[PDB]
């Protein structure tokens, strides 16, 4: 650290030392300049030790403040970071079943119970609009989570079991959405 006043002494005396070594005037002047250079070197050494200690303290303070701030930011912002990470991983996974179920649930076609994996079990999935019904449901077959399910009882929002023939094209507006279709796996 050659940016403190003591270093100046280190120059001056050292400069004189240089002028001495070429000159070689005598040993008494050599001893005098050696004493001056030694005292200046001790002063500069004490100053440099102080400077390096202070710089280390400042670095420790900075690297503690940064760690504390980053930890607080990460702890506070974890509810949404986890969900963003989850959906990044899911869209990067690029699976047909997950992609289809996510796309359906995008437009309100969420399921009302865990999608079963056995041979045949109940699944109650809501349907907001007739467009989704056309996209996924057809007759007794239902295409959700990339598997064929057997339509059993399309239940209106009013718990009124509606015959499948009722739901067709422009007759939807009379019926009050959103339906709750039940289905069973057909493997």
């Amino acid at each position: 650290f050659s940016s403190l006043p003591s270093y100046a002494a280190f120059a001056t005396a050292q400069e004189a030392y240089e002028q001495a070594v070429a000159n070689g005037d005598s040993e008494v002047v050599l001893k005098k300049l050696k004493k001056s250079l030694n005292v200046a070197k001790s002063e500069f050494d004490r100053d440099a030790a102080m400077q390096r200690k202070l710089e280390k303290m400042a670095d420790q303070a900075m690297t503690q403040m940064y760690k504390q701030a980053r930890s607080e930011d990460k702890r506070a912002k974890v509810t949404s970071a986890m969900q963003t990470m989850l959906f990044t991983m899911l869209r990067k996974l690029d699976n047909d079943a997950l992609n289809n179920i996510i796309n359906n649930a995008r437009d309100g076609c969420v399921p009302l119970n865990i999608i079963p994996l056995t041979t045949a079990a109940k699944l109650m999935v809501v349907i907001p609009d007739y467009n989704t019904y056309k996209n996924t449901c057809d007759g007794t077959t239902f295409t959700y989570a990339s598997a064929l399910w057997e339509i059993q009882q399309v239940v209106d929002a009013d718990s009124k079991i509606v015959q499948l023939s009722e739901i067709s094209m422009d007759n939807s507006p009379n019926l009050a959405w959103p339906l709750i279709v039940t289905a069973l796996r057909a493997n």
Binding site: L98, I101, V110, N113
Partner: peptide, 24 residues
């Protein structure tokens, strides 16, 4: 992948807990 489908269906069962539209 089948069990992942089921677990993700658990996540999507919640109506408004997670905003699918904002994330997808």
């Amino acid at each position: 992948f089948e069990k992942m489908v089921s677990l993700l269906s658990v996540l999507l069962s919640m109506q408004g807990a997670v905003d699918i539209n904002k994330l997808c």
